[PDB]
Amino acid sequence: PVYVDFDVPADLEDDALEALEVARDTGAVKKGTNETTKSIERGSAELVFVAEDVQPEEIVMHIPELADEKGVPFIFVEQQDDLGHAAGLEVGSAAAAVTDAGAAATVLEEIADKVEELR
Template identity: 75%
Template sequence: MSVYVTYDVPADLEDDAIEALEVARDTGTVKKGTNETTKAVERGNASLVYIAEDVSPEEIVMHLPELADEKEIPFVFVETQDDVGHAAGLEVGSAAAAIVDAGDADEDVEDITTTVEDLR
């Protein structure tokens, strides 16, 4: 487990989170990549942040959990960058992503947020 991963995410929660990201990508607004995700969190626009667990070097995303906590934005860890990237609509992996407008995934994002808060 990476240094920045602060809690274990059950496989079913990770699957639900990936599914919500895919729905939000198609019906809402999603930010892709560490820089766009960081900006969305800093501006308070993100409703859910995704952080890949296999990022190397770890410093690329190490700031995100702390920043998201500071802005009171929930975040979920996903096993691989490929999972995050593909769910966000990219053909390559992505170290991070954020849902800005959940679109049809609104209820799913709320459920995931509640579950994440319980896990932490």
């Protein structure tokens, strides 16, 4: 909420999650805020996911700006457990990062684009 500066349409989110699954079954994904963060910092991140129901928010506040000074695109997910589930986890996840997808390389390429337009 304080780290969220734009709202993502349910539909767009549903897409992104579907893409994250094929990216984890084809390409490569990072689960967890720390792994996601190092990813963004190392440049390997192509698309980072950030939940919106993270309490405390200190866990993620940094992502948005960090991602910006790295050109890394990012998208919000209304729920924490959905993102974790999508990342193939039996638990929730505050942040996930697609580190070079697969079979989704294109599908996500547009997602990054659609978001830009969404400010």
